Amino acid sequence: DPDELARRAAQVIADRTGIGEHDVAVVLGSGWLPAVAALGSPTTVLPQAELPGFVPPTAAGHAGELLSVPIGAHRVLVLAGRIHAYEGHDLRYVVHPVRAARAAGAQIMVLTNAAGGLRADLQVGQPVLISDHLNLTARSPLVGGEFVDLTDAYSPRLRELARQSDPQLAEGVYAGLPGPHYETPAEIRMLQTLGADLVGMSTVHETIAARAAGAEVLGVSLVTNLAAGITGEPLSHAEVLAAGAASATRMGALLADVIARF
Amino acid sequence: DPDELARRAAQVIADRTGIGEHDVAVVLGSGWLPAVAALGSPTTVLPQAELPGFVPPTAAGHAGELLSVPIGAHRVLVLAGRIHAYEGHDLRYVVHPVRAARAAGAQIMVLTNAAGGLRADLQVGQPVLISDHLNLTARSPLVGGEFVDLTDAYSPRLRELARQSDPQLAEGVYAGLPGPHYETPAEIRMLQTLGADLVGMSTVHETIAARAAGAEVLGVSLVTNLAAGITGEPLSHAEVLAAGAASATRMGALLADVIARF
Amino acid sequence: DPDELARRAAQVIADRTGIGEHDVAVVLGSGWLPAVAALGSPTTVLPQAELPGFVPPTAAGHAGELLSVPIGAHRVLVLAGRIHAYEGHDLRYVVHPVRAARAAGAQIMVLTNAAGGLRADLQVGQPVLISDHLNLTARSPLVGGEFVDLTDAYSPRLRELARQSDPQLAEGVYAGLPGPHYETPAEIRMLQTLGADLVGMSTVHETIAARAAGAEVLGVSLVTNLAAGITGEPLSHAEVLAAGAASATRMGALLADVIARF
Ligand SMILES: Nc1nc2c(ncn2COCCO)c(=O)[nH]1
Ligand SMILES: Nc1nc2c(ncn2COCCO)c(=O)[nH]1
Ligand SMILES: Nc1nc2c(ncn2COCCO)c(=O)[nH]1
Secondary structure, eight states, X not given: OHHHXXXXXXXXXXXXXXXXXXXXXXXXXXXXXXXXXHHOOOSEEEEGGGSTTOSOSSOOOOOOEEEEEEETTEEEEEEEOOOXXXXXXXXXXXXXXXXXXXXXXXXXXXXXXXXXXXXXSOOTTOEEEEEXXXXXSSOOSOXXXXXXXXXXXXXXXXXHHHHHHOTTOEEEXXXXXXXXXXXXXXXXXXXXXXXXXXXXXXXXXXXXXXXXXXXXXXXXXXXXXXXXXXXXXXXXXXXXXXXXXXXXXXXXXXXXXXXXXX | OHHHHHHHHHHHHHHHHOOSOOOEEEEEOTTTGGGGGGSOOOSEEEEGGGSTTOSOSSOOSOOOEEEEEEOSSOEEEEEESOOOGGGTOOHHHHHHHHHHHHHTTOSEEEEEEEEEESSTTSXXXXXXXXXXXXXXXXXXXXXXXXXXXXXXXXXXXXXXXXHHHOTTOEEEEEEEOOOSSOOOHHXXXXXXXXXXXXXXXXXXXXXXXXXXHTOEEEEEEEEEEEOTTTSSSXXXXXXXXXXXXXXXXXXXXXXXXXXXXX | OHHHHHHHXXXXXXXXXXXXXXXXXXXXXXXXXXXXXXXXXXXXXXXXXXXXXXXXXXXXXXXXXXXXXXXXXXXXXXXXXXXXXXGTOOHHHHHHHHHHHHXXXXXXXXXXXXXXXXXTTOOTTOEEEEEEEEEOSSOOSOOSOOOOOOTTSSOHHHHHHHHXXXXXXXXXXXXXXXXXXXXXXXXXXXXXHTTOSEEESSSHHHHHHHHXXXXXXXXXXEEEEEOTTSSSSOOOSTTTTTTTGGGHHHHHHHHHHHHHHO
C-alpha cells in the first residue's frame, strides 16, 4: 500500500529531520543537482536510500539525498536525486518520493527535469515552466480506479508566482517519454506535432501522483539541449550534462524566491 | 494458457447457465452498469468470481456479475463488472471475459465504455458507436505471432444495425489510453491531432482479443463528459459518475434493441 | 550484465566459427528468412539456441541459426530469425543478438524486417531503407544511464553505401509498435500524421541497443503490405510472412551487394 508506506517514509523524515511538517517538496533530478545548494542551507541531510519505500530493492546504485531546507516559514523537503521508470522500477517506487513528501506535509511539489527543447525559440540552459504535459509512457503510477483530473496539473497560480520572481519565464508543454535513450529526430518531429515544447524522461508520473494526492505542482524544465534533428548536429553529451548547470544554479535560488511566495 | 482457461470458463458458463451458446456478449463498462437492469429477463446470474479465470491473482475487489439473458433471437452473456488494465492486471485477465465469451458461442461482442468526448459537439450522456480505435496503450492482449488484422475491427455491419435502432447515433474513433488518470488538456489536443473523437481507458484490448478470436465487435461509448481542456473548465467527478445512471434504462433499451437486430 | 552476456555469446561465435571478429551482423526476421542462402556460403552454422543468452525454456518452438558468411570485405554474422517483444520476452533477450553481434566485432548491424508501407510511393515487395524510426513501444532496451543519442540512429553513411549497390532503395521512417496485432486504419492515419512511412513490430529496440553499443545500423524493411486502410482491405500475417519470399534470391543478393559496399 503506497499511502501507508508514504506515511512511514514521512514518519522517518520527521524523526530524522526533527521537523514534524514539510510544507513544500522539491524534486531535483537530472540537470538540476546545481539547484540543491542554491535552495538554501539544509538543516538536515539524509540519504533517501534510508527511507522506507525509497531507493529500490532489485538495483541499489547510490540514490541522492533528502535535504530539509527552511525557506522562511516553509520547510522544504528537497529531494536531491530521483529514480526513473527507465531504470526498471515499478512506478510506485518512482512516485513514492512524491507521495512520501505529501505525507510529510507538502502542499506543493516543485518537480524539475532536464529537457530537450522541441521548439524554435529555445535556448540551451533556458528554464521553462511546464504549463502541461504529454504522458507518452503508456503508464500511470495510479493503480485501481483513482481517476484524477489532470486539468491544471501544473498550477496556473504557481506559474504566476514564479513569473513574479522571473517575469521572463517561458512555459511549455513537456512530453514525458520513458527513455532512457534520447529521441530520434523523427520522434522529435512527432513530438512537435503532438504539441510538446519540451521532451524528457521523467516527471509525468510524479505530477500525476502529486495531483492524485491533492498537491499543487510547479514543473520546471531545464533545456539541456535542443532535441535531435533541430539544429542538424548530433547531441553533445557535455552540453546535455553541463550546459544548463549554471541555470540550475540561478534556478534553485529563483526557486527559493518562488517557494517563499507560496 | 489463456485460451484454455477461456474454454474452461465457457464450460462452466454453459453448465451453470444451461445455455450451450451465448451468441452475443456484452461487456458493461463504467457508467453502463445500471443498463443491466433494462436488458431483458436474465435466466442465470452468477458471480464472475465463480468463473474460471475471471478474478486475477493480484487485486481483489468484488468481481462483477455474469448474466445469461435471451434478447431477440440471441443468448446474451452480460458482464456487469469488469477488471481494467489500470488495476494492475495482466491483460490476459482483462480480455478473458471476451475470450470466455467467444468460447461460449459469442459471435458479437458488444463493448461499452465511458469516454471523454473529443469533439465538443458530442453531448454528455449520448452513446457513440466506435467506428475504429487508437490503441494508445503500447500493449496487446495477444502474445506471440498472432498477427490479427484490425481493418473493420468494429464491424460496419453492426454499426449499421445499431443505427437502425437509433439513427441519431454518432460514431467516432475511440482512443484507448491505459488510465486510470484522465488526460491533460495537452493530451486531449494531441488526441484530436491523432484523429480520435472519443477517449477512454478500456476496450481496445478486448476488441483486439475479440477480433483475434474471430468475434465481431460493436463498441459503444457513453460520452460521460467532454475531455479535459475542451470546455475551457475542469472535468467534474460529479458528471463522470452519474452521467449514465441517468442514461440507464435508455442505454439498456438501446442495447436490447440493437442486439435484437443482430 | 547484458554486456557480459553479449561477451559470453561473442566468445562462442569466435570459438565455433574460428573467426575472431565479425565486422557486420545481419538480423533476418519475418520476410527475409528465405534470403539466407542467397547471402553466400556460410563457413559455419550454429543454432542460436546453443549460444548463451539466446532462446527460452518457458515457451520453446524452434529457433534460428547464426551463420558466418564472408561478404565482400566482411565477415558477416548472419542471425537467421529473431525473437520479438510481442512474444513477451524481456527486451534484454530481444536485443541480446545485436549486443552479442556487437561484442563479436559487428560495428554495423543490418536489421531487416517486414513492414506495412504507409507512404504513397511504396509498394508491396519493395525493400525500404529505414531513415529514422518512431519508437512507439513505450519501452527501451536501455536500463539505467548510458547516454544514447539516436541522431543518425540509421547511419546516413550506411544508407549512402547501400545506395551505391541499389540506388533504387527507397527509405522511410519506421514506426515500431508492440504488435503482434496489426494497426487499425485510424492508427495508420495517426502513424502518417506522426510521420511514419513504414510500420512494424520489431527493430527499434535492436537499433537502440546497437547504437548504445556503438554499432551503426542499416534498417531494411520489406514492404509486405500497405498499411491497414490504405487499400481499404484487411492485412496479412502471410502476405506479410513473405510478399517477399516471392523474391528470395533478390533479397539475399540485395543484402550481399549492400554489405559488400560497407
Ligand atoms: N528525452 C530527453 N531528455 C533529455 C534531453 N536533454 C536532457 N535530457 C534529460 O533527461 C530527460 C529528463 O526529462 C533530450 O533531448 N531528450
Ligand atoms: N481516458 C478517459 N476516460 C474517460 C474520460 N471520460 C470518461 N472516461 C471513462 O471514465 C470512466 C473510467 O475510465 C476521459 O475524458 N478520458
Ligand atoms: N505492425 C505492422 N507490421 C507489419 C505490417 N505489414 C507487415 N508487417 C510486419 O508484420 C509483423 C508480423 O509479420 C503492418 O501493416 N503493420
